Structure formats: C-alpha cells, structure tokens
C-alpha cells in the first residue's frame, strides 16, 4: 500500500553517468547479513502445484531395507 | 704452512659460506650466454527474468590485484641466503664488462676508420649491440697499443683498396628507401594532420560562441 504512496509522491514534484571505479585497500564494502537481503529480493520464484499424495512415498520406504 | 687455504680446524658454519661461492660462479656464467646469443575488462551485464537489462554491480569496479597476482604466482621461488647479498664498492655503479674484440672485427674497424676520419656516430650501429661509449675508448687504447698501424690510416687520403663496395651497400640494404626524401614526405603528412586538427580547433570554437550567444539572448 505504501510503495504506491511513495511513487505518486515523486511524480508530483520530480526534481532532477556511471564509469568504473577501483577497489581500494582503505575502504569497506557491504557484506555479511545485509548482503543476504541483497540476494533474497531478486531471485527465481517457483510456482508450486500443491497436491496430496502420501502413499507413493509410503511404500517407497517399505520396499527399501 | 702457506698462508693461503689450509683446512685445519673446527670451522663452524662454513657450509652456508660454501654453496654461496659455488652459486656466484654459476650466476656469472649465465650472464655469458645472454651475450653469446645476442652476437648472432569492460563492464558486463546480464538478463534476468525478474529484472532484464540489469548491470552487475561487482563488474562496475575493478580489483587491480587479481591480474597482478596471476603472474606473481608464476614466478620462481628461491630461499635467500644472507651471505649471497654481499656488496662492495663495485655495486650500483654504471659500467659493465666489454666483450673483447676479435680480428674479424678489425677489418670492419680499420676500413671504417680508413674511409672516414674518425666518426663515432655511424660506426656504432655497424657493431649492432655495442654502444657509443666503449667504442670511443677502443680508439683511445689503440693509440698506446698499435700507434703505427693507426698512423697509416690518416696518411691514406684516397678511396682505399676497392673491397668496401659490398660494405658500402651492406650498410645500405637495411631498410632500402630514399632517406633523403623519405623523411620529407611523411613530415609533410604530419603538418597536414596538425593543420586539420587546427581546422577542427577553430571550427569547434566558432560554433561554441554562436551557441552561447543564443543563451545570452534568452
């Protein structure tokens, strides 16, 4: 509900270019726990077909010793 | 019991001294064979199903050390013996060992000194990997060594025994081009490119004043 509320706020009064950089040994880069949120936002969903089985796996254990 | 080298008592920790000496003799002999042989990374993107046409944030920056570390891994490893680094007055001073001259070189030395008076500029390249400094000293030491064989050369003021006709053209057959006019023609090309960038200079200048004059009106 609020991601639309911020998007309309920009377009009411919109008020206004990338070249490489160098890794420096006197500078830190974001890593650790917030990097896990940087890779948990954009990745491939899988649409599950929810089913109800429970006998195919059951006898699969019975036949195996 | 002569004062040079008796092996005669305990002599603690001489082994590190021993193989250092046998390695410095090995080092200088590999310097001999360099002489004998010489005589003769944009930016990358990808196409996600979620966000297509997205560019990689890690490829935006460069590490500047992974490329250096590849070759540094592929260098030879050696264990430094603190005896090996020894230094004397003959250290860190320019000058090297001159390869001593042969008599096969003297016929190209006497005749090049027979044709001209004494001209060290063009005779340097005749001996391709000899330099201007030590060949000047070869003129100097022969004054004391062979003073009379040099004294025949300046008396000779005539074209010599006509065998230099090959060595007249053996010098000439390297990069056969009319050098009296080869330098002229490409120099005229160079000032043509400078005149064209000078045309590009002022034509960039006149449109710039034209454009911002319109901004001064508005």
Curated annotation (Swiss-Prot), chain A:
Domain of life, per lineage: Eukaryota
Subcellular location: Nucleus
Remarks, miscellaneous: Present with 1590 molecules/cell in log phase SD medium.
Complex and partners: Component of the RNA polymerase III (Pol III) complex consisting of 17 subunits. Interacts with RPC53/RPC4. RPC53/RPC4, RPC37/RPC5 and RPC11/RPC10 probably form a Pol III subcomplex.
Function recorded in the entry: DNA-dependent RNA polymerase catalyzes the transcription of DNA into RNA using the four ribonucleoside triphosphates as substrates. Specific peripheric component of RNA polymerase III which synthesizes small RNAs, such as 5S rRNA and tRNAs. The RPC53/RPC4-RPC37/RPC5 subcomplex is required for terminator recognition and reinitiation.
Protein name (Swiss-Prot/TrEMBL): DNA-directed RNA polymerase III subunit RPC5
Organism field: Saccharomyces cerevisiae (strain ATCC 204508 / S288c) (Baker's yeast)
From Swiss-Prot, chain B:
Subcellular location field: Nucleus
Residues annotated as domain SANT: 96-147
Comp. bias regions, Basic and acidic residues: 201-210
Disulfide bonds: none
Described function: General activator of RNA polymerase III transcription.
Protein name, as recorded: Transcription factor TFIIIB component B''
Signal peptide: none
Organism: Saccharomyces cerevisiae (strain ATCC 204508 / S288c) (Baker's yeast)
